[PDB]
Design an enzyme around this catalytic site. Sequence first.
Site, PDB file in Angstrom:
ATOM      1  N   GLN A 157       0.773 -11.208  -3.550  1.00 44.10           N
ATOM      2  CA  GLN A 157      -0.609 -10.753  -3.545  1.00 44.10           C
ATOM      3  C   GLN A 157      -0.967 -10.152  -4.896  1.00 44.10           C
ATOM      4  O   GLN A 157      -0.139  -9.493  -5.532  1.00 44.10           O
ATOM      5  CB  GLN A 157      -0.822  -9.717  -2.441  1.00 44.10           C
ATOM      6  CG  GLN A 157      -2.217  -9.681  -1.854  1.00 44.10           C
ATOM      7  CD  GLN A 157      -2.210  -9.242  -0.407  1.00 44.10           C
ATOM      8  OE1 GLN A 157      -1.299  -8.544   0.036  1.00 44.10           O
ATOM      9  NE2 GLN A 157      -3.237  -9.625   0.331  1.00 44.10           N
ATOM     10  N   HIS A 187      -8.113  -0.469  -0.555  1.00 44.27           N
ATOM     11  CA  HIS A 187      -7.330  -1.689  -0.683  1.00 44.27           C
ATOM     12  C   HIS A 187      -8.211  -2.814  -1.208  1.00 44.27           C
ATOM     13  O   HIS A 187      -9.365  -2.960  -0.795  1.00 44.27           O
ATOM     14  CB  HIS A 187      -6.726  -2.094   0.662  1.00 44.27           C
ATOM     15  CG  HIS A 187      -5.998  -0.991   1.367  1.00 44.27           C
ATOM     16  ND1 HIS A 187      -4.651  -1.053   1.651  1.00 44.27           N
ATOM     17  CD2 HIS A 187      -6.433   0.192   1.864  1.00 44.27           C
ATOM     18  CE1 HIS A 187      -4.285   0.047   2.283  1.00 44.27           C
ATOM     19  NE2 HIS A 187      -5.346   0.821   2.423  1.00 44.27           N
ATOM     20  N   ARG A 209       6.229 -11.857   5.635  1.00 41.15           N
ATOM     21  CA  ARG A 209       5.789 -11.716   7.016  1.00 41.15           C
ATOM     22  C   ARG A 209       6.456 -12.779   7.875  1.00 41.15           C
ATOM     23  O   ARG A 209       6.535 -13.946   7.483  1.00 41.15           O
ATOM     24  CB  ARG A 209       4.263 -11.831   7.139  1.00 41.15           C
ATOM     25  CG  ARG A 209       3.487 -11.049   6.093  1.00 41.15           C
ATOM     26  CD  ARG A 209       2.248 -10.414   6.700  1.00 41.15           C
ATOM     27  NE  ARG A 209       1.103 -10.476   5.800  1.00 41.15           N
ATOM     28  CZ  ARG A 209       0.685  -9.467   5.048  1.00 41.15           C
ATOM     29  NH1 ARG A 209       1.305  -8.298   5.053  1.00 41.15           N
ATOM     30  NH2 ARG A 209      -0.381  -9.635   4.270  1.00 41.15           N
ATOM     31  N   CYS A 212       0.803  -1.220   0.000  1.00 44.05           N
ATOM     32  CA  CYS A 212       0.000   0.000   0.000  1.00 44.05           C
ATOM     33  C   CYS A 212       0.840   1.277   0.000  1.00 44.05           C
ATOM     34  O   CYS A 212       0.609   2.136  -0.862  1.00 44.05           O
ATOM     35  CB  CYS A 212      -0.987  -0.032   1.172  1.00 44.05           C
ATOM     36  SG  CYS A 212      -2.109  -1.449   1.167  1.00 44.05           S
ATOM     37  N   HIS A 237      -4.542  -0.785  -5.197  1.00 40.48           N
ATOM     38  CA  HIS A 237      -5.028   0.303  -4.360  1.00 40.48           C
ATOM     39  C   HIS A 237      -5.556   1.414  -5.256  1.00 40.48           C
ATOM     40  O   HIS A 237      -4.865   1.850  -6.180  1.00 40.48           O
ATOM     41  CB  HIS A 237      -3.924   0.825  -3.433  1.00 40.48           C
ATOM     42  CG  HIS A 237      -3.446  -0.190  -2.440  1.00 40.48           C
ATOM     43  ND1 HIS A 237      -2.505  -1.148  -2.749  1.00 40.48           N
ATOM     44  CD2 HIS A 237      -3.785  -0.400  -1.146  1.00 40.48           C
ATOM     45  CE1 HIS A 237      -2.284  -1.904  -1.689  1.00 40.48           C
ATOM     46  NE2 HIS A 237      -3.046  -1.470  -0.701  1.00 40.48           N
ATOM     47  N   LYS A 280     -13.177  -3.641   6.560  1.00 41.57           N
ATOM     48  CA  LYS A 280     -12.874  -4.486   5.416  1.00 41.57           C
ATOM     49  C   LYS A 280     -14.022  -5.437   5.116  1.00 41.57           C
ATOM     50  O   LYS A 280     -14.624  -6.012   6.027  1.00 41.57           O
ATOM     51  CB  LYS A 280     -11.586  -5.281   5.659  1.00 41.57           C
ATOM     52  CG  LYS A 280     -11.376  -5.667   7.116  1.00 41.57           C
ATOM     53  CD  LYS A 280     -10.166  -6.566   7.294  1.00 41.57           C
ATOM     54  CE  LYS A 280     -10.124  -7.641   6.229  1.00 41.57           C
ATOM     55  NZ  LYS A 280      -9.142  -8.716   6.540  1.00 41.57           N
ATOM     56  N   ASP A 293      -2.389  -7.536  -5.367  1.00 42.37           N
ATOM     57  CA  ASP A 293      -2.745  -6.300  -4.688  1.00 42.37           C
ATOM     58  C   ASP A 293      -3.104  -5.194  -5.676  1.00 42.37           C
ATOM     59  O   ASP A 293      -2.618  -5.154  -6.809  1.00 42.37           O
ATOM     60  CB  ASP A 293      -1.593  -5.842  -3.795  1.00 42.37           C
ATOM     61  CG  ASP A 293      -2.074  -5.260  -2.491  1.00 42.37           C
ATOM     62  OD1 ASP A 293      -3.306  -5.172  -2.319  1.00 42.37           O
ATOM     63  OD2 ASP A 293      -1.233  -4.898  -1.641  1.00 42.37           O
TER      64      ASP A 293
HETATM   65  O1  WE3 Z   1      -6.042  -7.731   3.910  1.00 44.02           O
HETATM   66  C1  WE3 Z   1      -5.781  -7.950   2.772  1.00 44.02           C
HETATM   67  N1  WE3 Z   1      -5.964  -9.297   2.206  1.00 44.02           N
HETATM   68  C2  WE3 Z   1      -6.458 -10.398   3.048  1.00 44.02           C
HETATM   69  C3  WE3 Z   1      -5.754 -10.523   4.286  1.00 44.02           C
HETATM   70  O2  WE3 Z   1      -5.620  -9.692   5.412  1.00 44.02           O
HETATM   71  O3  WE3 Z   1      -5.255 -11.700   3.972  1.00 44.02           O
HETATM   72  C4  WE3 Z   1      -5.877 -11.674   2.821  1.00 44.02           C
HETATM   73  C5  WE3 Z   1      -4.984 -11.798   1.576  1.00 44.02           C
HETATM   74  C6  WE3 Z   1      -3.917 -12.830   1.985  1.00 44.02           C
HETATM   75  C7  WE3 Z   1      -4.184 -14.200   2.018  1.00 44.02           C
HETATM   76  C8  WE3 Z   1      -3.179 -15.080   2.423  1.00 44.02           C
HETATM   77  C9  WE3 Z   1      -1.926 -14.589   2.798  1.00 44.02           C
HETATM   78  N2  WE3 Z   1      -0.870 -15.504   3.225  1.00 44.02           N
HETATM   79  O4  WE3 Z   1      -0.011 -15.125   4.276  1.00 44.02           O
HETATM   80  O5  WE3 Z   1      -0.717 -16.757   2.595  1.00 44.02           O
HETATM   81  C10 WE3 Z   1      -1.673 -13.220   2.779  1.00 44.02           C
HETATM   82  C11 WE3 Z   1      -2.670 -12.339   2.375  1.00 44.02           C
HETATM   83  C12 WE3 Z   1      -5.264  -6.782   1.917  1.00 44.02           C
HETATM   84  C13 WE3 Z   1      -5.898  -6.441   0.723  1.00 44.02           C
HETATM   85  C14 WE3 Z   1      -5.419  -5.372  -0.031  1.00 44.02           C
HETATM   86  C15 WE3 Z   1      -4.317  -4.643   0.415  1.00 44.02           C
HETATM   87  C16 WE3 Z   1      -3.687  -4.981   1.609  1.00 44.02           C
HETATM   88  O6  WE3 Z   1      -2.574  -4.243   2.053  1.00 44.02           O
HETATM   89  C17 WE3 Z   1      -4.167  -6.048   2.363  1.00 44.02           C
HETATM   90  O7  WE3 Z   1      -3.537  -6.394   3.572  1.00 44.02           O
HETATM   91 ZN    ZN Z   2      -3.756  -3.013   0.846  1.00 43.82          ZN
END
Ligand code: WE3
Ligand code: ZN
Lengths: 401, 401
Positions: free
Chosen positions: B140, B270, B122, B93, B144, B224, B142
């Site tokens: 992701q 987002h 992470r 973001c 925005h 969200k 992603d």
């Molecule tokens: O929130 C978000 N998306 C979900 C959330 O939270 O997890 C969802 C997406 C996801 C699934 C699995 C893993 N994983 O670690 O395998 C990571 C992330 C989100 C959306 C847009 C921008 C952002 O900056 C976000 O943070």
């Molecule tokens: Zn986001």
Amino acid sequence: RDHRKIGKQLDLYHMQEEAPGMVFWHNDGWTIFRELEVFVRSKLKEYQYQEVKGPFMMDRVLWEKTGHWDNYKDAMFTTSSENREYCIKPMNCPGHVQIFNQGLKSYRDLPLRMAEFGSCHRNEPSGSLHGLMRVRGFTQDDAHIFCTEEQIRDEVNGCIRLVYDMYSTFGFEKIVVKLSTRPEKRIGSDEMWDRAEADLAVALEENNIPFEYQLGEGAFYAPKIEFTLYDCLDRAWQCGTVQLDFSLPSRLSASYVGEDNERKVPVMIHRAILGSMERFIGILTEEFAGFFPTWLAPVQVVIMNITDSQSEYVNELTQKLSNAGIRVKADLRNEKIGFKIREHTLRRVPYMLVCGDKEVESGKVAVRTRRGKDLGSMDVNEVIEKLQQEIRSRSLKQLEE
Amino acid sequence: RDHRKIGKQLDLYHMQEEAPGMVFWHNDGWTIFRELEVFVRSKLKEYQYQEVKGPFMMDRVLWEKTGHWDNYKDAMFTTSSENREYCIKPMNCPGHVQIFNQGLKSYRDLPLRMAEFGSCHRNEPSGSLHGLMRVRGFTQDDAHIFCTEEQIRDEVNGCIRLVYDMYSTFGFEKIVVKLSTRPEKRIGSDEMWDRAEADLAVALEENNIPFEYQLGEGAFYAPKIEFTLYDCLDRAWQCGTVQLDFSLPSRLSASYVGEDNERKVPVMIHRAILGSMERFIGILTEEFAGFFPTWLAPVQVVIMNITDSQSEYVNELTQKLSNAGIRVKADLRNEKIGFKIREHTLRRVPYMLVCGDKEVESGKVAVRTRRGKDLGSMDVNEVIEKLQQEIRSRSLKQLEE
Ligand SMILES: O=C(N[C@@H]1C(=O)O[C@@H]1Cc1ccc([N+](=O)[O-])cc1)c1cccc(O)c1O
Ligand SMILES: [Zn+2]
Ligand SMILES: O=C(N[C@@H]1C(=O)O[C@@H]1Cc1ccc([N+](=O)[O-])cc1)c1cccc(O)c1O
Ligand SMILES: [Zn+2]
């Protein structure tokens, strides 16, 4: 003619001190990066390469087998997690062998060509950073070939042919080739280094390539053929690199079952034609002075109106051009026609489509280029077919020039 | 039906302790990953999205300015260079805001949709990792969106429409939706949360979507909308996420010039349709039990010969199919035809082409599939034409099937 100026001039990318030596690829610049990927992947399919992806950091213990840690840890980024240190990879070589180690390999799997668009990170001093040429985070068109000692000739020749194949696409036909021999700080036996250096030398004589030796400029584990290209300003740029490795696969427990049903260590061939793709974009930016070929142009066609009467017609043409796979943008602003052409000419858009009321029968368009040429009016389907030939063939020159 | 267990059988991926929770994408698995990327990019062009790319780490000083450092310090990797901290980004973001911050923006540039295949990292607990579902490094889909408050629909409905449009391609229309409200530890005044929670709530009634509240489960900056899909086993999978953000763009000094010629702060939305693409591939692997649709198959067609008499004929067919855009492999090994068919059937290759002496005379090929069904001998052009028909539409079901 400076790519940093053109890159800001054309909305290509940007950098800031919060991330020194790392690129914020904008939409227009990222399109060029992705277009290069499509071109490279087309060569990967042609030359029968696999494409993989490795993790972005690994245990330092692994980097310890290779000796990479001994030579350049100061250039390596490092992170810790649960009392374990990890290093953000500066190269994709150990990541590829780990994939090779999974599953028992035989001689029927060789030669094994494995490529990746590996984004690497090296801790270079901030005073050494300059635009896209020298960066901390860059992406290689890396590939590593696993083969037997009998396949060394054929595989190295294929890498050499690939170097001249891709360079000719961008118009780089002046190539200087150097053979980097052993450095004073290295690993591996003397007899290994003799065979590896001789094999690279023999491959160059077979293809009739003149070259000069570069003593002490090879890697600590492999001699490398270094390819240097010259731009239209006769400036040397070192991009290509082909290394012959007999050391690392043995150090990382890579093996295969041979024809004699016995343990053998596979020969590994490192290759990278363009080198840093961020650097290569900078070379292309300065080589063409922002006049990218049509297949590399962020915006290929701009359609503009004279009044609001052709706003309906321009939108239909923009949709039709987009459906044909052409990167087309519509200019519907209330500005004078000479104003619009000057702005997009400064943006180095290859073609500008003018639609007046005379265009509204004809299903035709007035075509003009970034070079100031006038091409006149005729068919929209004709320009679609005319253009599609230009992008698909990756032609260096435009229509009528 | 376990993705880790199928993934080892199909050359999809592998993991090891040297990089816990990070994926070694092999050739077949990476083909599926890229194959999903093209599908997403087709949607980005359809919905008028830009595509950018951000650096892998940034100055932590920014991660303070967002408040992410205070809340999620343990989950972010950190590295050192020249007495300065950088953090490998867990989110894309603020990297997107930097691209938005470069150059003065106006209301004519809004709404501005900026998407990226951002690779995040992470620091999740190692006893907490499990296959592709829970990883440390993921990518992701992603995006925005920057817009004014009056546009708080037109973008939110587009996000909702995109969620159901993309899920239907993979056969997921059993979807349950939840709305996460404010947690105790958040930023922004109460009046944002009243408007932001209401704006998302009306949009779901707007779209005739039943939903349940998840009180206190939202982010510290945004409520969200959470989309949960159910597979053929009626198992809940949470992938989609749409956040309504009024805080961070103000915190990151993002602004644009409004119609009244005054500095205004843009609203940020987002969104992530598939979420982590590594997770989504694992869900798809279990949903189809390795029987990926033809457009998603790593290897789509395998042509095999019975003896060496048809070796030339299969090679011509492989070139013709490859030139048609079909991921095709030729099997010329000195093995029995029943041995070859069994190997690729276990590989879940959608179609297998057998060429005997009767096939090379007649100019046709014998096709019959990974499920055991026959199409008999059909025209070579007919098999190509139907396949492109199958791949281009991304059909979930097979040929007469
Ligand atoms: O929130 C978000 N998306 C979900 C959330 O939270 O997890 C969802 C997406 C996801 C699934 C699995 C893993 N994983 O670690 O395998 C990571 C992330 C989100 C959306 C847009 C921008 C952002 O900056 C976000 O943070
Ligand atoms: Zn986001
Ligand atoms: O060795 C290699 N290449 C040099 C090496 O080492 O640095 C050279 C390449 C390089 C590129 C960009 C920047 N940059 O900061 O823009 C710095 C350095 C190499 C070659 C082929 C395959 C491989 O697997 C390699 O590893
Ligand atoms: Zn290498």
